[PDB]
């Protein structure tokens, strides 16, 4: 008939992205660099009716983004302080006075004055101390030691992130969502929930519960190279404590630097330990094998502890007040499946080397009086052996927050399109995108707005700004400079969509007649601006 | 030459070393288009 | 002032941090420093004579 393309900028459409997201939060502690902005106080939510969207956990680009934010967040806090290259003496390790695991060691230092040096005495816990006057600090031979700045806390604080301008994060709302797949109720959010930074490794803690089942997710779950992230619906409480009372005491290394050092012990010496219900744990396992059944056949499902390697694999390792437990979870991973409570020892280093980092180790200064701390367990992380054998484990610290944002995807917003029309020459955003075409086009300025809505950050800010002013560039050279909605004078082809007009208007959405015409849309761009020109 | 002037227009917007070259580029552009609408024609090529 | 007593004195700041010494190029002589706004702002001088704070 007499149809012509119409340009349409603003529309409610989308393609998968990657970008540099931002944080926003709500003393020094180490994740509170305040690199980042404070928080809305009442963040949107916008359900998309009629939308749905494929998810994939394992392919989710804002883990790596977590994942360097993190570390960049523990080094730049550890800047700021005390070297201690200085003690990197031979040490005089005895048990004299402890025991009838911890050592009592005496050795030289300087004093502020570089001519003088005095003798001082510290405790050591073995798993610090190397043999070699017979002991040396394990990394000596490797690297410099710093130890923690002593102001700062380590106690994890919510952080969110949030989209740029002209990007968006969708939510996945599917209770029964396992990680990957379609999903069929999604959301757009301003940003995520707050996700803890909480450091552990054989189980997961302090983290989001199911809401309806145990949901087991793997990226493939007949695979033995890939882990099991299980998250439960129900916590299990884990009591840790650290019984010794041990004092800290301060030693003057040099011109304003204190080293600190466990002094002496009060009182008995006693192995640091975790609490965890029998019958607790019991329910757990019931259910998570239950659970399991359904991914392998009905075989004898058994629970082994891990096989071995370094203690930071093999152990349970977490920060409880600020001291690092490394606890002995073979009692619970002990157990055949068919168709009282537990204690797990632990123990305590002060000279740790996080994220798998060789040669950054850093010193935790003793925390003085006795510690305790309850931690909920909301998930495991399990593994296949080569009857199927699971095995606790996996020390990559991505599979920890990929627990937590595997509910976001990260899109772009594709606002500039067209459709045929006759012309001739409040949902929130993304709210239509489930509407149809007819609709959808009256809320054009709602996205409009959100495309101009450190180095990195800048560097996001300049490219949007970018982004922006090549696609009114575009439009000035089609023509319509200044509109949402610009009538053109190219014909409609029926070549590129044979569908009606009311088929287009009524029943379609923007983001099917996207699909539709996809392979036409550089024809279209090129007609138009072939035509302006004449 | 007045036929191919997309062609030069579209090569207007195309560490701090970058970052400083890249946001004076974008000013640049702005302050011709701020001209221009100054004069009128905001969004042609070609104005009479 | 800058020794103070503990082979009997120490410098007064060395239990406390490192001294860095000036550089012996560098003159401290103050130049004027003009401040200026940057686009979209404006500065606004009050010229009344009699002008407290
Ligand atoms: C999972 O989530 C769980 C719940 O959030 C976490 O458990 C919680 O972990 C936190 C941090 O470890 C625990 O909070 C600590 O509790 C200590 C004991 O407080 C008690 O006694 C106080 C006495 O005054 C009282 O006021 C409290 O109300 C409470 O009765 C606190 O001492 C500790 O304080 C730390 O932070 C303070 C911030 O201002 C700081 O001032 C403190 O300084 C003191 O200690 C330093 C040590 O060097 C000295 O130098 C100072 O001079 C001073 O003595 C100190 O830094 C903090 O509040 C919380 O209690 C615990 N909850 C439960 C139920 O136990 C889990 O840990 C999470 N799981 C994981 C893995 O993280
Ligand atoms: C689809 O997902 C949305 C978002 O989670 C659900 O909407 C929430 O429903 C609960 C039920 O009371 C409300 O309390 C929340 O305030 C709603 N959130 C928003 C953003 O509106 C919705 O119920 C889910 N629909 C289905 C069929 O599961
Ligand atoms: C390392 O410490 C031990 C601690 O026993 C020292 O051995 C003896 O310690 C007693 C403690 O009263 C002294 O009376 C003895 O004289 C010490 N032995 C000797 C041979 O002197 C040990 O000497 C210390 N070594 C170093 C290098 O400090
Ligand atoms: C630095 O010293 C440490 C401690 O002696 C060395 O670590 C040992 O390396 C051997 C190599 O076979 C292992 O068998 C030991 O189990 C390691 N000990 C510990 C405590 O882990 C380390 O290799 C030395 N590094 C260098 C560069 O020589
Ligand atoms: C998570 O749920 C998804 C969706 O059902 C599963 O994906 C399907 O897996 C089967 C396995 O044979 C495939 O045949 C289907 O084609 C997959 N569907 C899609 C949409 O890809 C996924 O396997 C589940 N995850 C786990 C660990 O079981
Ligand atoms: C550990 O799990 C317990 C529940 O078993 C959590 O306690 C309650 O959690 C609900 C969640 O909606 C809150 O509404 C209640 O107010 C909480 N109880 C109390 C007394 O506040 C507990 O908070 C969980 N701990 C962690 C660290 O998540
Ligand atoms: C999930 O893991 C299974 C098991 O490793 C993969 O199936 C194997 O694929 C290789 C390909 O060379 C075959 O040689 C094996 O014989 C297959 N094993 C079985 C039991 O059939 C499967 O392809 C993986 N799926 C994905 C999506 O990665
Ligand atoms: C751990 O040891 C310290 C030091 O003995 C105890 O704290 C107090 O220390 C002062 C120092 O003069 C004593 O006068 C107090 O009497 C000590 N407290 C008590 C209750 O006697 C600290 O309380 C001990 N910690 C625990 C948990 O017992
Ligand atoms: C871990 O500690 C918590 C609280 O410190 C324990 O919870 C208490 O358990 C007793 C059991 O009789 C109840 O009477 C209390 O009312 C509970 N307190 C609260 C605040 O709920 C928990 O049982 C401990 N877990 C283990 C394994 O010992
Ligand atoms: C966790 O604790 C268990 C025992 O509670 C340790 O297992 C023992 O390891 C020694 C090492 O030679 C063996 O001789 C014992 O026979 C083992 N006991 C059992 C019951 O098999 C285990 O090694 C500890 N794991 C870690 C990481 O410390
Ligand atoms: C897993 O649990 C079983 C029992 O539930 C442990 O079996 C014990 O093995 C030791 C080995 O010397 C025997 O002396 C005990 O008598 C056995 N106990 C029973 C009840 O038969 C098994 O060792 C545990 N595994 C680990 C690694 O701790
Ligand atoms: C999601 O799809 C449903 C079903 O097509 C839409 O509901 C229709 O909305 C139109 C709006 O004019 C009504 O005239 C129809 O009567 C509704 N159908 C039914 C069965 O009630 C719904 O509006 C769509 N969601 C969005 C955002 O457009
Ligand atoms: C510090 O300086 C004083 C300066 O008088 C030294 O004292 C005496 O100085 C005279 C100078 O000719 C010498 O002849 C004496 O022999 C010095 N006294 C002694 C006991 O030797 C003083 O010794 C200096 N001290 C140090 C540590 O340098
Ligand atoms: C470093 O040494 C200086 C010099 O002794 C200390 O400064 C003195 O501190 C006392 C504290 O009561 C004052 O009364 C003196 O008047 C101070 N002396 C001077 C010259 O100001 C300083 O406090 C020491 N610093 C540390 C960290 O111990
Ligand atoms: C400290 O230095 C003295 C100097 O003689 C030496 O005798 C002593 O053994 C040294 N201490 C240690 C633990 O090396
Ligand atoms: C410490 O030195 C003594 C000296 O005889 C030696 O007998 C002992 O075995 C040494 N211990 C270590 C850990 O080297
Ligand atoms: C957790 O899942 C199990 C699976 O059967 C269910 O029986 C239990 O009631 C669920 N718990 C919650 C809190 O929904
Ligand atoms: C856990 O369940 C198993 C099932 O065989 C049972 O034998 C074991 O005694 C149970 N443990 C507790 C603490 O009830
Ligand atoms: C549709 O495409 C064909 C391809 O040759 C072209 O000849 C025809 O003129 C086009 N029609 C319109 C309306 O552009
Ligand atoms: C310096 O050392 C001498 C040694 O006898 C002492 O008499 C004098 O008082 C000391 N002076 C200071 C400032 O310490």
Redesign the pocket.
């Known amino acids: 008939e007499n149809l012509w393309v119409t340009v349409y900028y603003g529309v409610p459409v989308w393609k998968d992205a990657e970008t540099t997201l931002f944080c926003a939060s709500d003393k020094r502690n180490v994740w509170a660099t305040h690199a980042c902005v404070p928080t809305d106080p009442n963040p949107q939510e916008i359900v998309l009716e009629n939308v749905t969207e494929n998810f994939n956990m394992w392919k989710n680009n804002m883990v790596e983004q977590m994942h360097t934010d993190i570390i960049s967040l523990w080094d730049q806090s550890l800047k700021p302080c005390v070297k201690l290259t200085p003690l990197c003496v031979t040490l005089n390790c005895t048990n004299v006075n402890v025991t009838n695991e911890i050592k009592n060691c005496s050795f030289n230092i300087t004093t502020e004055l570089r001519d003088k040096k005095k003798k001082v005495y510290a405790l050591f816990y073995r798993l610090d101390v190397?043999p070699i006057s017979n002991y040396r600090l394990?990394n000596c031979?490797?690297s410099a030691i710093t130890q923690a700045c002593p102001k700062v806390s380590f106690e994890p604080i919510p952080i969110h992130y949030c989209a740029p301008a002209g990007f968006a994060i969708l939510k996945c709302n599917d209770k029964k969502f396992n990680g990957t797949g379609p999903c069929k109720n999604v959301s757009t959010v301003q940003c995520t929930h707050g996700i803890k930074p909480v450091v552990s490794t054989q189980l997961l803690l302090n983290g989001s519960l199911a809401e309806e089942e145990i949901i087991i997710r793997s990226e493939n779950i007949t695979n033995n190279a890939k882990t099991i992230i299980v998250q439960l619906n129900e916590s299990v409480e884990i009591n840790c404590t650290r019984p010794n009372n041990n004092t800290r005491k301060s030693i003057r290394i040099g011109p304003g630097q204190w080293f600190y050092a466990t002094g002496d012990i009060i009182g008995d010496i006693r192995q640091a330990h975790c609490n965890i219900s029998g019958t607790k744990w019991n329910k757990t396992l019931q259910q998570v094998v239950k659970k399991l059944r359904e991914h392998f056949n009905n075989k004898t499902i058994i629970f082994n502890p891990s096989s071995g390697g370094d203690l930071e694999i093999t152990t349970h390792s977490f920060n409880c007040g600020g001291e690092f437990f490394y606890c002995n979870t073979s009692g619970l991973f002990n157990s055949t499946w068919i168709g009282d409570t537990i204690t797990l020892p632990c123990r305590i280093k002060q000279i740790i080397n996080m994220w798998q980092r060789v040669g950054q180790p850093m010193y935790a200064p003793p925390i003085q009086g006795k510690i305790r701390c309850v931690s909920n367990i909301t998930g495991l992380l399990l593994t296949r052996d080569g009857t199927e054998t699971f095995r606790p484990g996996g020390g990559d610290m991505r599979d920890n927050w990929r627990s937590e944002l595997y509910k976001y995807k990260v899109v772009k917003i594709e606002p500039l399109g067209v459709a045929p029309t006759r012309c001739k020459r409040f949902l929130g955003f993304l709210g239509a995108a489930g509407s149809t075409m007819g609709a959808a086009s009256m809320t054009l300025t709602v996205q409009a707005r959100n495309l101009l809505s450190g180095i990195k950050q800048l560097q996001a800010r300049v490219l949007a700004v970018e982004r922006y002013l090549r696609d009114q560039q575009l439009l000035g050279i089609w023509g319509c400079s200044g509109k949402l909605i610009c009538c053109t004078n190219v014909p409609w082809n029926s070549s590129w969509s044979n569908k009606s007009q009311d088929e287009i208007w009524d029943n379609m959405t923007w983001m099917e007649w996207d699909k539709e015409i996809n392979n036409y849309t550089d024809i279209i761009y090129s007609l138009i601006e072939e035509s302006q020109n004449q």
């Open positions: 190397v394990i031979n490797t």
